[PDB]
């Protein structure tokens, strides 16, 4: 059940891809650590909730 993922390596030693290993020890998912590999989304539903969405170089009002 060992899960192996890659580290986003910031400062590199003078020595490529480095990994880390994870194993869940408990049956309940609430017991689990945070994976922190998170997906991002569009701001659109807040920044542009328009019914007719318009392209920025055209007149906003027409």
């Amino acid at each position: 059940g060992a899960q192996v993922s890659s580290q986003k390596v910031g400062a590199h030693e003078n020595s490529s891809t480095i990994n880390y290993t994870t194993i869940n020890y408990y049956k309940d998912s609430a017991s689990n650590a945070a994976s922190k590999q998170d997906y991002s989304q569009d701001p659109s539903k807040f920044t542009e909730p328009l019914k007719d969405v318009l392209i920025k170089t055209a007149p906003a009002l027409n």
Binding site: G1, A2, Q3, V4
Partner: peptide, 4 residues
């Protein structure tokens, strides 16, 4: 194992 499960390597992503």
């Amino acid at each position: 194992i499960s390597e992503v």
